XYZ file of N, CA and C in Angstrom:
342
model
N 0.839 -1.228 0.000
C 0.000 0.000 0.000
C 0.860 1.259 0.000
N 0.284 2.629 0.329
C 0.613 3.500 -0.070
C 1.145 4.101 1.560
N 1.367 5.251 2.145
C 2.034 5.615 3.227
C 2.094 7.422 2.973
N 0.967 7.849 2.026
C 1.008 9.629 2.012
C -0.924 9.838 2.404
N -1.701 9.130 1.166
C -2.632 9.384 1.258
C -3.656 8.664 2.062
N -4.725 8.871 2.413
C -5.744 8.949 3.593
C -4.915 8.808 4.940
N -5.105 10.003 5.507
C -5.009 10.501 6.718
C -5.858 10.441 7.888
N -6.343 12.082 7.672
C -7.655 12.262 8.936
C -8.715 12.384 8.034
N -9.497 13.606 8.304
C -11.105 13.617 7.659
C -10.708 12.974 6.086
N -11.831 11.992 6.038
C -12.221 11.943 4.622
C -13.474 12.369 4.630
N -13.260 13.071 2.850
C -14.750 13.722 2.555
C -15.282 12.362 1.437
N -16.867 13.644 1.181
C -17.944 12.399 -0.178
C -16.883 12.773 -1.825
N -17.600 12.384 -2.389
C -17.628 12.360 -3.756
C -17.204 13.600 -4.038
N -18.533 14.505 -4.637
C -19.111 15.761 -4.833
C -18.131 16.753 -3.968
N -17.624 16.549 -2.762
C -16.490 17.802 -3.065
C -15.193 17.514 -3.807
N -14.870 16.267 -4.402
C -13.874 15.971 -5.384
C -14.191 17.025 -6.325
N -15.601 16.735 -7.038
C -16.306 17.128 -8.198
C -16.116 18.681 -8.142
N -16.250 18.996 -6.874
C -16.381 20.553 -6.948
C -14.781 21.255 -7.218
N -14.086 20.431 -6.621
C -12.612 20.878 -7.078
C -11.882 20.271 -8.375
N -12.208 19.184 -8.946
C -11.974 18.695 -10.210
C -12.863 19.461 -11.128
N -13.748 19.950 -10.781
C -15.090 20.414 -12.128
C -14.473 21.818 -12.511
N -13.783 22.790 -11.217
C -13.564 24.455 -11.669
C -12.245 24.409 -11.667
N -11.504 23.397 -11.186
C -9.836 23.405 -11.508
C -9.882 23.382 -13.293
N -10.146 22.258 -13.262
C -10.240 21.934 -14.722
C -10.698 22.828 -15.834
N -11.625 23.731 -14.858
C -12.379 24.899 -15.872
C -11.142 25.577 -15.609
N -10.347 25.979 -14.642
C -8.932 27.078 -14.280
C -8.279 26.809 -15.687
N -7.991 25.588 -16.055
C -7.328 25.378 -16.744
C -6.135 24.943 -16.419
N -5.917 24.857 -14.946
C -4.898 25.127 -14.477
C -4.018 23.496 -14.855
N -4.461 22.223 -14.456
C -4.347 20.818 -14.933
C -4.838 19.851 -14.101
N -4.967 20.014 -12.786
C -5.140 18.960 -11.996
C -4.968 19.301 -10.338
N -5.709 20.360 -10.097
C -5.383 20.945 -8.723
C -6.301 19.943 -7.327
N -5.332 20.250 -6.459
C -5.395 19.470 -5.531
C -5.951 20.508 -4.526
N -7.177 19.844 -3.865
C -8.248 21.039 -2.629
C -6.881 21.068 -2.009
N -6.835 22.203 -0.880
C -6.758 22.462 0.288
C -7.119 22.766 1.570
N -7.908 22.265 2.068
C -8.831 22.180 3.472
C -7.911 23.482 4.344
N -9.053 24.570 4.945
C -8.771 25.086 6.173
C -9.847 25.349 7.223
N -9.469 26.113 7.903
C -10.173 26.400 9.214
C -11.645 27.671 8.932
N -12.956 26.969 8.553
C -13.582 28.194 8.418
C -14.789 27.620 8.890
N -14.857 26.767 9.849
C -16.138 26.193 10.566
C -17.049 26.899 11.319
N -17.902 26.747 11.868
C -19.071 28.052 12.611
C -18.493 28.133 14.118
N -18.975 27.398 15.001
C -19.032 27.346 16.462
C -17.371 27.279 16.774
N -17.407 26.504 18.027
C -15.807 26.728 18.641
C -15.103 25.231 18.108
N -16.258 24.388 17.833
C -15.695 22.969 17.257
C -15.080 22.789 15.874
N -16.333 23.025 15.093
C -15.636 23.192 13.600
C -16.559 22.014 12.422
N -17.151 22.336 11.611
C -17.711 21.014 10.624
C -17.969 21.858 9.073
N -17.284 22.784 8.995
C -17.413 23.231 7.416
C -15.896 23.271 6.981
N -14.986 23.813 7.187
C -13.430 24.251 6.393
C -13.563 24.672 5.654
N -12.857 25.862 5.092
C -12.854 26.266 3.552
C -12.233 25.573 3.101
N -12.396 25.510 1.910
C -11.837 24.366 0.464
C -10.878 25.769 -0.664
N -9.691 25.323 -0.868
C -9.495 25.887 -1.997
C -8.928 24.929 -3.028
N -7.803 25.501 -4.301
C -7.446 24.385 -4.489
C -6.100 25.018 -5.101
N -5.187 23.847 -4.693
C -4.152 24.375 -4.241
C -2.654 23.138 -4.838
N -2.164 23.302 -6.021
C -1.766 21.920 -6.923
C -0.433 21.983 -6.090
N 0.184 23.065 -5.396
C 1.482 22.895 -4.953
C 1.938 22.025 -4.314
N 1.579 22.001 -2.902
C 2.179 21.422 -1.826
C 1.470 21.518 -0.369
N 2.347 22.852 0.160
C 2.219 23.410 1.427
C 2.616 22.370 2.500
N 3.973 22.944 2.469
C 5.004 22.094 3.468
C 4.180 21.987 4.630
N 4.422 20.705 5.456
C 3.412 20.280 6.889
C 1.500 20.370 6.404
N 1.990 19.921 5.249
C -0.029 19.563 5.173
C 0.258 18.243 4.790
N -1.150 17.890 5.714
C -1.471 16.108 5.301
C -1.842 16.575 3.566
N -1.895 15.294 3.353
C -2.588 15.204 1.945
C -3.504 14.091 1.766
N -4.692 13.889 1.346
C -5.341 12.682 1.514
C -6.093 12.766 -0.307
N -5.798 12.071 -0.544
C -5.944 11.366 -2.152
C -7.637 11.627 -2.506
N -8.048 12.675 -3.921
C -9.474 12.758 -3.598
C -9.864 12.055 -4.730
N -11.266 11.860 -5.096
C -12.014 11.180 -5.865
C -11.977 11.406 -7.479
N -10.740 12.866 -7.629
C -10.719 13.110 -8.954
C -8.856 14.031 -8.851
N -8.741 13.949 -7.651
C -7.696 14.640 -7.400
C -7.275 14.484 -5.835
N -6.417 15.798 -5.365
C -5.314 15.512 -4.430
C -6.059 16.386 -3.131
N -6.576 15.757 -2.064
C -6.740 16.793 -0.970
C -5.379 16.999 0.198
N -5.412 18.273 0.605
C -4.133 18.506 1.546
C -4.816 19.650 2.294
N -4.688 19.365 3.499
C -5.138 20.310 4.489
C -4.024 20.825 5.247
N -4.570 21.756 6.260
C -3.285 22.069 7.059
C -3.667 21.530 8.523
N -2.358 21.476 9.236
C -2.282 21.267 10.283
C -3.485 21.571 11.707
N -3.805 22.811 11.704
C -4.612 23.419 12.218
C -5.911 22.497 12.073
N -6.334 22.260 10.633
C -7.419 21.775 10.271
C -7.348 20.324 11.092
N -6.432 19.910 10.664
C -5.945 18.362 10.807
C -6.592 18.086 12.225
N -6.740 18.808 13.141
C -7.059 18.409 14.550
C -8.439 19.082 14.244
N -9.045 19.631 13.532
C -10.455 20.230 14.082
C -11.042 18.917 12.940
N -10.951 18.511 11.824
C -11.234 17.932 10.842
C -10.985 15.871 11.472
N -9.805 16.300 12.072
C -9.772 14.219 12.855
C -10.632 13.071 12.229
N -10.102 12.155 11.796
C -10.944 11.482 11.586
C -12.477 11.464 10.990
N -12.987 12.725 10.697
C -14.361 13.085 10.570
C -14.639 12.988 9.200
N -16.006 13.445 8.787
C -16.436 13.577 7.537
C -17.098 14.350 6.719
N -16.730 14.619 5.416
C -16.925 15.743 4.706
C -17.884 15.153 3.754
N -18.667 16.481 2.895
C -19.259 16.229 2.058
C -19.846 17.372 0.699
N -20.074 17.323 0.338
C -20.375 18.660 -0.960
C -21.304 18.699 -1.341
N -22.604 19.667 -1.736
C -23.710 19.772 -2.708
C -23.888 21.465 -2.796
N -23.346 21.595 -4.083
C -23.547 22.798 -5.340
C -24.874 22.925 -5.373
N -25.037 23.709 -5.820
C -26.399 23.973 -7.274
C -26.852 25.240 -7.040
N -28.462 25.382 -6.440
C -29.063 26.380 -6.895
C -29.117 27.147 -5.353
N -29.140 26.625 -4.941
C -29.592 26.887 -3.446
C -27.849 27.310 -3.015
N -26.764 26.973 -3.318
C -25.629 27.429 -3.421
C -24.968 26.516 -2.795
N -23.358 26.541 -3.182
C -22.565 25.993 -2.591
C -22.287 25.376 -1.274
N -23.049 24.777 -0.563
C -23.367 24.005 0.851
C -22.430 23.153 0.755
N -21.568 23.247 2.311
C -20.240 22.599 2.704
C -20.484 22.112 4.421
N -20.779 20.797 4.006
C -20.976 20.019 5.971
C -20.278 18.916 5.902
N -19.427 18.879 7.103
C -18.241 18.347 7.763
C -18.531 17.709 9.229
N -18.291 16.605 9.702
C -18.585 15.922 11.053
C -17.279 15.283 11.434
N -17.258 15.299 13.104
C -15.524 15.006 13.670
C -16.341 14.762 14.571
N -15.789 14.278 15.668
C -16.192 13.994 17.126
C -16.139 15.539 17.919
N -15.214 16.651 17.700
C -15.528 17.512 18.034
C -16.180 18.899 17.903
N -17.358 18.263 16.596
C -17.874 19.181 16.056
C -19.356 18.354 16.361
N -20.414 17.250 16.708
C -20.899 16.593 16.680
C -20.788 16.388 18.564
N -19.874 16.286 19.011
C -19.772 15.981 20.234
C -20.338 14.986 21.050
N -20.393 14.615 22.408
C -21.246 13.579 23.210
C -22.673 14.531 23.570
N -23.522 13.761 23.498
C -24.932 14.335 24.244
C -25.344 13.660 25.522
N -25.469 11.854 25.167
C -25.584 11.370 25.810
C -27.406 10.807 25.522
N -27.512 10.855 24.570
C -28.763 10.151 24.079
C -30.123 10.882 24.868
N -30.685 12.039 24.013
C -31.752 12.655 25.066
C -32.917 13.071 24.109
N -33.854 12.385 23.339
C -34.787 12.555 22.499
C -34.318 13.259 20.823
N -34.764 13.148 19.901
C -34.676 13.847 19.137
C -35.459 14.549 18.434
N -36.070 15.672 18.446
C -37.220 16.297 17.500
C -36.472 17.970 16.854
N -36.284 18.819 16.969
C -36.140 19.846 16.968
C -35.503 21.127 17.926
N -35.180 22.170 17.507
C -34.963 23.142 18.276
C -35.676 22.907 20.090
């Protein structure tokens, strides 16, 4: 096996797509996301996405569905193990992300609403 790619968070499909679909429109050849820190609360479950074919010395890199994801460090602990996902369209660019510390313990107490 391999010893660079899958790390921590893996994401779905569809944010491959979203960075393979407008790289490719860049023209640029084959850019690889870069995950950072742009989540809501104090935990974290969105990151900004860019895309980013270089490098960026001390980023994981985790292998995506059409290309190369690499996050940074920072992310790397808010992002852990968790999971990403993508849906575009009309309603706009929607970006949700789950980790253990974005999701947290509750402790099992009904579920309905606000």
């Amino acid at each position: 096996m391999i010893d660079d790619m899958a790390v921590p968070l893996t994401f779905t499909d569809a944010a491959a797509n979203k960075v393979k679909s407008l790289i490719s429109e860049e023209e640029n050849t084959d850019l690889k996301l870069r995950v950072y820190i742009t989540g809501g609360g104090c935990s974290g479950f969105q990151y900004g996405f860019t895309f980013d074919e270089k490098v960026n010395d001390g980023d994981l890199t985790i292998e995506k569905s059409g290309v190369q994801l690499v996050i940074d460090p920072m992310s790397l602990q808010y992002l852990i193990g968790g999971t990403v996902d993508y849906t575009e369209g009309l309603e706009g660019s929607r970006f949700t992300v789950n980790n253990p510390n974005a999701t947290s313990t509750c402790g099992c107490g009904s579920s309905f609403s606000i």
